[PDB]
């Protein structure tokens, strides 16, 4: 296993419906090995002077690091927001079989 | 985009009220671009020889990596706990406009 | 603090019961300083032709990076799934006292 | 000190004269704090399936990681080779004063 | 470019002849894009209780990070020393064309 | 092998005499497994707004990453310059036996 060659990408969505549709798509298109959805999220950010709170859903998408650009482009079309949160974190170590599986199902 | 110049910091809180107070403060103080709150967390650790379980709330704070020390100091200063969990994970890749936005709103 | 010498490892479980059992074990065995359990997770993956959805629980395990191989072996052994998700993400910066604590409670 | 916010960039040159010109330029332009020149290098690469050996000089350029794109653009512009070797390696730890100095003289 | 997907590997050799043989081989076998040889090295380490000084030559081998294990195997197998120094350092940023070239000639 | 748990630290010295003295000391004190000296270096930096060129020697010091702070403290203490260049680069991959050896001889 090459350190950081698999990544865990985080994507924020407005609701569960959208998150599922994106999640299903990225897997079906082989852009990700799998996705975890974390619901009941409260996002806190500053907008036009004031601080806003919204209900959101968070995706943890596990994929090859080489696919992150392609994953990001896809998430950009489908347009959850004008500017979509996509951040990829590199996996330094882990369960080799599983890490090999994430590669095998995205080649 | 410089790899790892934006970070995702994780902070554990005793409840939603405290997590929201801290979240609103770090954004208002420009120490973070935004905060995701993940509720209904069960924390499992050892204390006085026994293994404890607590209800907690988890913050995923997205900010510049250069601000993490300042972020930590602030959280230290206001957090209820004697020793606050603050761990920062570097963002290797992502949506450039979003990554640019995180920098823009924290300069 | 040496950058990346503490890691946050993520492990997916079928349910709360199993997640708690594994969480308690890794702490008791000093393989992790602490574990956060994130419930009500929906996992989306391909199940041999179909796209599947399951209810799962997610563990965020905080430990020394040197212990991740030992943590994985243990999880491997007692995990239901044939192939367990264990992914470790390195902590670049943080609260030094806390980072020191994670090391203190996992030394042997 | 933020890990990896200073980098050590390596640049290959055909000879000492060119390396010095580039080295002096990047420092005068504040794109680097300083440059170490390693002479008497033998470079070994293929080209049309045949293996070449050339005399080269290697630069180790120490600078902010945020300046690496700007550094690379400049080196592209003045380097005799069509495709210039510029590779940046991040500095995880070091002498803080010196790391602080590299930042101070490139701001 | 995926951060850290190209590496610069350093290998220590007893002399120029050996270093060149190994260098030519790894390039010919497509295990590396190119190799820089840094001569006139003095190595300082402890041997049988006393501190030794040897004349050595240092290789900086630029290749895909995915190839480092294969590179190491080859070197370990051919290298004079029982335990060969092979250390790989990841390239976080650089000249994209050149980084693309390193991949192209090693696929 | 834990990625980045061994580091290659670079230290600049005014001449070979000093470099050898420091190199011998860090090895004898178990702060490093071994040191490569790269001589005939030309350093280019700015000083009182004027660009200087000096003859220097470069050390590549291979050690545990956990020891880098202790290594730096020692170097700062024996090093002639007021502000010593010490930069540590993490080793992501390599020859495991050798990586194991660097740890063995510095425990
Ligand atoms: Na990597
Ligand atoms: Na030639
Ligand atoms: Na590390």
């Amino acid at each position: 296993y090459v350190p950081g060659s698999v990544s865990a990408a985080f994507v924020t969505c407005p609701n569960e419906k959208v998150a599922k549709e994106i999640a299903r798509a990225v897997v079906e298109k082989r852009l990700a090995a799998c996705v975890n959805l974390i619901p009941q999220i409260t996002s806190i950010y500053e907008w036009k002077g004031k601080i806003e709170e919204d209900s959101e859903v968070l995706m943890m998408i596990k994929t090859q690091s080489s696919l992150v650009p392609a994953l990001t482009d896809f998430v950009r079309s489908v347009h959850p927001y004008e500017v979509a949160e996509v951040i990829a974190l590199p996996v330094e170590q882990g369960n080799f079989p599983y890490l090999q599986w994430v590669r095998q199902v995205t080649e």
Side-chain angles (χ1 to χ4, degrees), chain A residues 5-16:
Chain A
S5 65
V6 163
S7 294
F10 280 91
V11 186
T12 302
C13 298
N15 74 5
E16 198 155 277

Side-chain angles (χ1 to χ4, degrees), chain A residues 28 31-39 41-42:
Chain A
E28 221 145 14
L31 288 150
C34 69
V35 181
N36 298 303
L37 278 78
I38 308 157
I41 288 180
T42 309

Side-chain angles (χ1 to χ4, degrees), chain A residues 61 63-77:
Chain A
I61 300 168
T63 182
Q64 275 179 110
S65 303
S66 54
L67 286 166
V68 171
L71 177 63
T72 301
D73 291 357
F74 174 68
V75 169
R76 285 198 70 69
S77 46

Side-chain angles (χ1 to χ4, degrees), chain A residues 33-39 41-47 49 51-61 63-70:
Chain A
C34 69
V35 181
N36 298 303
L37 278 78
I38 308 157
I41 288 180
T42 309
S43 283
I44 288 104
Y45 55 94
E46 200 202 313
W47 180 230
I51 289 170
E52 302 298 351
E53 300 191 21
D54 290 58
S55 282
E56 298 200 306
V57 178
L58 191 65
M59 294 169 82
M60 189 170 81
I61 300 168
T63 182
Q64 275 179 110
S65 303
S66 54
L67 286 166
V68 171

Side-chain angles (χ1 to χ4, degrees), chain A residues 84-97:
Chain A
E85 171 169 356
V86 189
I87 59 170
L89 302 165
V91 180
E92 204 188 32
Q93 310 184 75
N95 187 7
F96 179 71

